[PDB]
Curated annotation (Swiss-Prot), chains A, B:
The active site is at H220 (tele-hemiaminal-histidine intermediate). Residues 8-327 form the DhaK domain. Changing D380A: Loss of kinase activity. This is Dihydroxyacetone kinase. ATP binds at D385, G386, D387, T388, S431, S432, G468, T476, M477, D525, P526, G527. Substrate binds at G58, S59, G60, H61, K109, D114. GO terms for cellular component: cytosol. The C-terminal domain consists of a eight-helix alpha barrel. The eight helices form a pocket that includes a tightly bound phospholipid. The cellular function of this lipid is unknown; it has no significant effect on enzyme activity. GO terms for molecular function: ATP binding; glycerone kinase activity; lipid binding; metal ion binding. Catalyzes the phosphorylation of dihydroxyacetone. The lineage of its organism: Bacteria, Pseudomonadati, Pseudomonadota, Gammaproteobacteria, Enterobacterales. Residues 356-540 form the DhaL domain. InterPro entries: DhaK_ATP, DhaK_dom, DhaL_dom, DhaL_dom_sf, Dihydroxyacetone_Kinase. One of its GO terms (biological process) is anaerobic glycerol catabolic process. The gene is dhaK.
Length: 542, 542
């Protein structure tokens, strides 16, 4: 039932911590020696002269909170087990470990377990002479009737402000004051299509509503505030924006954080970002934080939108650089500029011209392929889609038509090939059309460089092989074409030899035919056969 | 069926592009004016004097490739629909739009659709005089028997090297040479627990093998090379490391990229990072790229490991700063340092002392609670877990025992309270224990500041409320405690009044009792009742 990458369940959180450290951009993180049941990460920049800002809580919201430890933000983070509050002992240990006379501010997300455990910790700390303050963050607005708003993504915006002042030597009282001020100006709303996968065997797959979306699903998977009858990005985001606007002051600039709860695709997150930029909330946004996975719920497929009012010191504090593994640098929503380029008409130019010889070839090649439609479909039907005959016929007739309408530059092969190369893909769908267009386009160009027909045709083959990836023996027209083009390269005028070569190659494709679970002529590749018949026709006209 | 955030299916990719631009860190991205069916993103830093490096392919791998467009990397990216190759027209348009005499290098992931479409494009470009080169990247090693290795995450490492040389004015030939050299030294292997959710109605949920993992699942959800009978992070990573080692040179330094296909939790990604750091591959790693979502498969819950050999110019080129939305700065795997702190024994010190008065109170309070065990469980059983009586009895007896063993500092309330506060949570499990410990700890400290008992008890209540979050009327012991403590604050010695107050409060909890779907005494909160009986006992001893 467990769909989770992990090793020993009991070492889960510890392993996450090791990984976070191993990838530390600043290499400013360090575990704190302690009993295995205490999981504290602290910064190596320990400057007890400044006020310590400690945070934490149950794990499963990485990069929170370890990812926000460092200069300008969190001093330490107390990590509980997955979605489980840290022990009182653990919290105390962190306080004593990084708190100097300046004191420390505990930033706690609104959840009983954390409030009670960090709380008893603060109390035990105070008895030991430490100066402690606690700020409970409850930024969720999904449940108006809730006495205790849950603390979610916005919490880190609180870390940011608290960190600003703490690093700059302001006193505990000031840190708390400002931190509380930020909290009071932070509003978040989340939505999810499905809950998260837990690192354990469960009773039922993650909660999910088909075609719908649960507004307000908690970061621990808690029941949300409602269910939206659609997953449409615009509808979902605008609904969220309305509720955000109803909670925000009617005026003032805003910073908005687009947080990925863990399971939304980057593509989706981009679309969400676009919706937000087009929402009624748009004209008041001066900064975007994300889209990014900042405060997650394991792999929960949902996202959250956090709006913080930019009053007073808030904005100054948000924009200050810090040194953490995951703080994202705020960015003003950029406008979508549209660049214009100077592109020459791809369309190949030409002037109809006669040449009885060439016309005779074009007519012959053209007819042979056209006549083979049903036979080539039959061969293709064996394993393919039974349409190769029609695809090839489509191209033949297109060039035949142009021929019959005296529209071909028959007197100039280079331009003629270039013209066919341009027209085939338009009438021939699928890889066949593209490959043939590649063939003639490259051939037409080799001729433009003044090469003889056979040389150009071989270059066409060479290019068809490079892009197509096929080789002699893979059962495609190549198996008959190459032999023929090689035959002609030695005997430029011996059409009988060319045909014979192509014919042998086509025959080889009947052997290596896997699909066959007597004469085996029904296992012949249509491409090769078509090719062999073309040369056969050419050889019989000489 | 569709579990995807999007609006109009036909505008999906376009909306993703808009969002990518809106969030552009460098604001160096711009859409290219064109037919709606052509989706090209180009850099505003267009310097046609240098060789252009174009990429792209089907969408759903964000941030690739739009996220690697910029100085030092991609010049432009051609975006097809979700998991569908861009049109030939589209690719050409990009070439003509950003290519100067210096020419351009097309970097294509190994997939027919892309090879054929970028291919015909290159051919049509060459006829127009542009100098073009194409490098097909096939870094996947999951399918040894495959003639055409799929191109996955490693592709961007190729963009990095190509970009290095192109920005520095080297010629096309050199760009291609180096780009090919990087490719040849790039090896990737992916694994997934489930395929991705598509932006459409489907026949069945994403492919998934319960308890197992599909090794080599493609970035388009293509069938992998095998199925691992476990999801264990260590086993899975070591298996992958073996195969990587079998493909890598037996010696040489390495850069390893840990890519999140889109649906793995950040926690999981950290654990994976730890496994890699402990794998036999460990001693040859000088740089880590990620964990991060770099080349995704929508929300596919899997990850990939790419190893690139650091020979010649590779390392120099990897470490150069570039200007893109998502290139991650490589980091040396940090070692996990363990810090030591100086923490004073939390354990409260005391010396047994007598005091008949206090002892009489402790005995009385202690007994009353103990006697009420079964009755309080009965009340708690109504809606709670029916254990409050036992939890409270557990604490009572613990303090009674200490009392009976002449172990209490009876002559010093401050230390006595501090001692009880320390011992309750140890014997009382759950929030009840923590709350009571909070109460006494804070009370003991208020006394230490030289306050009278009633004042200290009120501070205890105040702290219990702050952390506990409960208020008068929420149906907890507070409903009886507060009234009593307030009564005593006015009449310090009138125990009868205190009891009566507590009793009224306990009675109030019988009314607001929701659970009841006569006398209503069975709807009384255990906490409140326990509290009322304590005071009743005190009042009856005077
Ligand atoms: C899928 C639909 C494709 C539709 C293709 C239509 C166009 C067919 C190709 C027209 C070729 C015109 C060749 C012009 C004749 C020529 O080059 O004469 C010069 C040379 C030497 O002089 P001589 O002819 O007077 O003795 O002629 C030759 O060397 C003979 C070689 C002829 C090779 C023909 C190959 C045709 C392409 C086969 C493609 C098959 C695709 C299924
Ligand atoms: C369900 C949990 C209920 C918790 C109730 C706590 C009840 C405390 C009872 C205190 C009686 C009220 C004080 C009366 C005024 C007074 O002054 O009494 C005289 C004396 C000295 O006061 P002074 O120094 O200010 O002049 O007060 C005392 O001696 C207080 C003795 C406290 C004994 C506490 C026993 C605690 C047992 C905890 C068991 C926990 C089980 C979960």
């Amino acid at each position: 039932m467990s769909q989770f990458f992990f090793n020993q369940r009991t070492h889960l959180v510890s392993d996450v911590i090791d990984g976070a450290i191993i990838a530390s951009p600043w290499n400013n993180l360090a575990r704190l020696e302690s009993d295995p049941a205490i999981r504290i990460v602290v910064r190596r920049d320990l400057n007890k002269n400044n006020v310590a800002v400690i945070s934490g809580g149950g794990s499963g919201h990485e990069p929170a909170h370890v990812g926000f430890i460092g200069k300008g933000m969190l001093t330490a983070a107390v990590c509980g087990d997955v979605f489980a509050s840290p022990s009182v002992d653990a919290v105390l240990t962190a306080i004593q470990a990084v708190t100097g006379e300046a004191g420390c501010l505990l930033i706690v997300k609104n959840y009983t377990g954390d409030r009670l455990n960090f709380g008893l910790a603060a109390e035990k700390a105070r008895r030991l002479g430490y100066n402690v303050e606690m700020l409970i963050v409850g930024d969720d607005i999904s449940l108006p009737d809730n006495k205790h708003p849950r603390g979610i993504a916005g919490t880190i915006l609180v870390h940011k402000i608290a960190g600003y002042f703490a690093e700059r030597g302001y006193n505990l009282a000031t840190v708390l004051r400002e931190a509380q001020y930020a909290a009071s100006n932070t509003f978040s709303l989340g939505v999810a299509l499905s809950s998260c996968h837990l690192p354990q065997e469960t009773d039922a797959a993650p909660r999910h509503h088909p075609g719908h979306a649960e507004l307000g699903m908690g970061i621990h998977g808690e029941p949300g505030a409602s269910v939206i009858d659609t997953q449409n990005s615009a509808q979902v985001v605008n609904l969220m924006v309305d509720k955000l606007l109803a909670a925000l002051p009617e005026t003032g600039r805003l910073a908005v954080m687009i947080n990925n709860l863990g399971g939304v695709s980057v593509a989706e997150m981009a679309i969400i970002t676009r919706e937000l930029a087009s929402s009624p909330l748009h004209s008041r946004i001066d900064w975007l934080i994300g889209p990014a996975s900042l405060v997650t719920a394991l792999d929960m497929k949902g996202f959250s939108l956090t709006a913080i009012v930019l009053e007073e010191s808030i904005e100054k504090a948000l924009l200050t650089e810090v040194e953490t593994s995951n703080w994202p640098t705020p960015v003003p929503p950029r406008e979508i500029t549209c660049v214009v380029s100077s592109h020459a008409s791809a369309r190949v130019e030409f002037q109809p011209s006669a040449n009885a010889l060439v016309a005779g070839i074009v007519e012959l090649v053209t007819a042979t392929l056209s006549d083979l439609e049903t036979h080539l479909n039959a061969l293709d039907a064996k394993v393919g889609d039974g349409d190769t005959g029609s695809t090839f016929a489509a191209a033949a007739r297109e060039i035949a038509s142009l021929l019959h309408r005296q529209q071909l530059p028959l007197n100039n092969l280079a331009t003629l090939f270039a013209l066919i190369g341009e027209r085939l893909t338009v009438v021939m769908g699928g890889s066949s059309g593209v490959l043939m267009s590649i063939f003639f386009t490259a051939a037409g160009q080799k001729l433009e460089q003044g090469a003889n027909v056979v040389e150009a045709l071989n270059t066409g083959l060479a290019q068809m092989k490079f892009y197509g990836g096929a080789d002699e023996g893979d059962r495609t027209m190549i198996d008959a074409l190459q032999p023929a083009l090689t035959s002609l390269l030695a005997q430029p005028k011996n059409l009988q030899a060319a045909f014979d070569a192509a014919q042998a190659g086509a025959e080889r494709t009947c052997l290596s035919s896997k699909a066959n679970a007597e004469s085996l002529l029904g296992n012949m590749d249509p491409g090769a056969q078509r090719l062999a018949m073309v040369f056969k026709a050419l050889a019989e006209s000489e």
